[PDB]
Design a protein around this ligand. Sequence first.
Ligand SMILES: CN1CCN(C2N=C(Cl)Cc3ccccc32)CC1
Ligand SMILES: CN1CCN(C2N=C(Cl)Cc3ccccc32)CC1
Lengths: 325, 325
Amino acid sequence: MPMQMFMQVYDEIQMFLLEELELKFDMDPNRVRYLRKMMDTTCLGGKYNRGLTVIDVAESLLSLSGARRKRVLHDACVCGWMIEFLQAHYLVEDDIMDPDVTVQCAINDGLLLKSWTHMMAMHFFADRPFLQDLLCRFNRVDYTTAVGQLYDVTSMFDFAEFTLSNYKRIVKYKTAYYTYLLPLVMGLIVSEALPTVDMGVTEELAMLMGEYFQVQDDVMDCFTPPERLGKVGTDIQDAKCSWLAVTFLAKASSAQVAEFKANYGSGDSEKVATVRRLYEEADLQGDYVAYEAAVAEQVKELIEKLRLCSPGFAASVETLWGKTY
Amino acid sequence: MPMQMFMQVYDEIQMFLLEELELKFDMDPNRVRYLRKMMDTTCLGGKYNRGLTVIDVAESLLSLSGARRKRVLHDACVCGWMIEFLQAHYLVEDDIMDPDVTVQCAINDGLLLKSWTHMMAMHFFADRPFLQDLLCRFNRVDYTTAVGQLYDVTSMFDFAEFTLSNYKRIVKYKTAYYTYLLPLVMGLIVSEALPTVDMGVTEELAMLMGEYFQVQDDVMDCFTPPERLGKVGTDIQDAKCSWLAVTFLAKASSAQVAEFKANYGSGDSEKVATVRRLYEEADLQGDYVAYEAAVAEQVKELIEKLRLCSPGFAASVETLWGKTY
Ligand SMILES: CN1CCN(C2N=C(Cl)Cc3ccccc32)CC1
Ligand SMILES: CN1CCN(C2N=C(Cl)Cc3ccccc32)CC1
C-alpha cells in the first residue's frame, strides 16, 4: 500500500496547487486545465523510484523508533512528490537543450514545476519545525545538480578530464545527490531522525549506488539496442565522459587511443561502430562485471556499519539498493 | 554612498559563492573563472534599480524607527543582489526563447543564477530570524512571475483577452510583484518592520507603479526609434497584449478593428507600419498622457495614506516612484 497512498496524495497536492491558482492567482479555467494536463504529463508515468524511497524510509523509522504516524507518512508522500516534480523539472530542461510558442511553454513548464516544489512544501509543512531545514537541503541539492550538469556538459571543453576520479565527480553531483541521497535524507527529516544516522556512511552509500547506476547506464547506452534500452544510445556521438570512455583510455594502446580520438564524438554511423568495435576488442564488458561487483560489495558492507547505530534505516537503504541492483 | 556599498557587498557575495564551489563543490579553477566572468556579465551593467530600493527602504527605517545598523544595511545589500541575480536569471531565460553547447551553458547559467540567490541567503542570513520568511516570500514572488509570464505568452492563444483588466493582470504578475513589491518587502524584512506597514496600500502602490511603467514601456516599444529606445520594438510583430492594443480596440470602428486584426501580429514592415498608422490616427499618444496622469495621482495619494502609519517608509516608496516617473 505505499503506492496507492502516493498516488492519492498526488491528487491532494494537485488539487491545492490548481485551486490556489484559481483563487489567489486569478487564473482562468482554460489555463487551469492546461496546467492540469501538463502536470499529469510530466510528473506521471515514471517508476516513482525517488518518491517511493521517502515513504519506505519514513515507514521504517516510525515502526522501529498515534496521530504522529499519520502525519509523518503524509509528509513523506509530499516530499516524495517534491522530488518527482523536481525530476519532471530536470526532464523538461533536457528537452529544451535538444515567436516559438512551444519553446516558451516548455521553458515556462520547467519554472512552474520547480516552483511547485516550493509551493507544496510551504503549504503542507507550514507548521512543521523542519520546513526551513527541508528547503535549505532541497535547494542545496538542486544547486548541486546544476553544478554537476556543468561538469558533465563541459567534460570535453575548457580528453584531459576523461579520468575515473572526475567521472565519479560528475556522477556525484549530476546524479548521486538528488537521486539517492536526497530521498533518503527527506525520509529522515519527516521522521525527525536526521541526527540519529551517520551522514558519512549515508553519503558514501549514495555515491556508490549512483556510481553503480551510472556505469550500468553507460554500458546500456552503448551496447543495448534501441528497442531494448527504451531510447537511442547517444553517448558516443555526444562525446560524453562515460565509464566506457575513461576505462578504455586506461587500457588502450597508443594507436587505439588515436583511433578512439579520431572516431569519438562523431555522428557517423560507422565511426560510432568503430568506437563500439574498440570497446568490444578491449573486453570492457568483462571489466564492467568486475567493477560492478566491487561496488556492490562496498554497498553490502557499508550498509552493515550503518545498521550498528541505525538498524531500521539500513533496511530502507537496502531496499533502495535492490532497485538499482 | 548606497551604490559604493552595493558594489562592495557584490565582491563579498561573489567571493563566498566561488570559494564555496572551489572548496565544498570540488570545482577546478578553469570553471571558477568561467563562472566569475558569467556572473559579472549577467549581473552587472544594469541600473540596479531593484537592488538599490532595498537599501533605500532599509536606511529610511533604521534612521526613522548601534551594531544593529551595520547588520541591517548589510542584509539589505544581500537582498538587493538576490533580486538582481534573480533579474539576471529572468534575462537569461528570455534569450533561450529566442550538441548545441552555447544553449546548454545558457540553460545552466539560468539555473546557477537562480540557485545563487538561495545560496547567498542561506549563508549570510543563516542565523537571522527571518531567513525562512524571506525564502518563502521570495519563492512566492518567483512563482508569481512564472504565472505572469504564462498569462503574457498565451495572451493570444487558448483577441478575447485583449482587455484592460486582463492587461493589468499580466502587468501585476509578470512585472509588478518582483520589480516593485518585492524590493519594498525585502527592505521591510531586514529592517524587521514588516508588520508596521499596511500591506494593502503597499501592494496597491506596487501594482500602480508597475502599471505606470508598463504602459510607458509599451508606447516606447512602438513609437520610440531603435537607437533611442535601446532595443528594437517587437510588440506588434509578436502580437503582444500591449496597452496600445487594448486601448485601440476600445475606441476603434468596426473596420479599424478588422484592419487591426488583419495586420497585428505580422513581421512585414508595412503591416507593422499599418498598425502604427492606426495607433497614430486614433490619438492614442493623447490618451496615453491622460491615462498616465490619472495613475500618477493615485500614486501621490496612496503614498499619503501609508505615511499616516509609516512615515519613513513612504519616503522610500516616494523615492522609488520618482525613478519610474
Ligand atoms: C485523478 N486522476 C488519476 C489518473 N491520472 C493520470 N493521468 C495521466 Cl495523464 C497519466 C497517469 C498515469 C499514471 C497514473 C495516473 C495518471 C491523474 C488524474
Ligand atoms: C571586483 N571587480 C569590480 C569590477 N567588476 C565588473 N566587471 C564587469 Cl565584467 C563589469 C562591471 C560593470 C560595472 C561594475 C563592475 C564590473 C567586477 C570585478
